């Protein structure tokens, strides 16, 4: 899966989640597009590995 967005126009803030599955899908492309589209001037990103092979 999913791509989500929750905005707070009052604070110029948007909570964005880019959760993709498989190797042929790159969430960073989605990030690049949204950063540009929203005109964000500062960002903080945490990358998680969902369903780590050695955990499952």
């Amino acid at each position: 899966x999913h791509l989500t967005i929750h905005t707070w126009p009052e604070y110029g803030y948007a909570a964005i989640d880019l959760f993709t599955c498989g190797e042929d899908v790159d969430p960073w492309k989605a990030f690049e597009h949204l950063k540009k589209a929203l005109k964000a001037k500062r960002v903080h990103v945490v990358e998680h590995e969902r369903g780590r092979y050695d955990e499952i």
């Binding site: 993709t20 945490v46 990358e47």
Partner: protein, 61 residues
């Protein structure tokens, strides 16, 4: 490695008009899904009052 990759992002100092435009946000979220290489399963966006936009694009493959 892992079944999926998940970016948890904080966007600051955005264009406030864009953040409150539900039609534009939906358009840009669908484009981002397209740019990432993902398939769009479903899409749903809500316009909050007096301001605010929530949105979800369920993807896959």
């Amino acid at each position: 490695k892992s079944l999926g990759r998940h970016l948890v992002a904080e966007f600051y100092e955005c264009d406030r008009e864009v953040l409150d435009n539900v039609q534009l946000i939906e358009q840009e979220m669908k484009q981002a899904a397209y740019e990432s290489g993902a398939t769009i399963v479903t899409s749903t966006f809500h316009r909050f009052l007096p301001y605010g936009v929530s949105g979800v694009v369920v993807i896959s493959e």
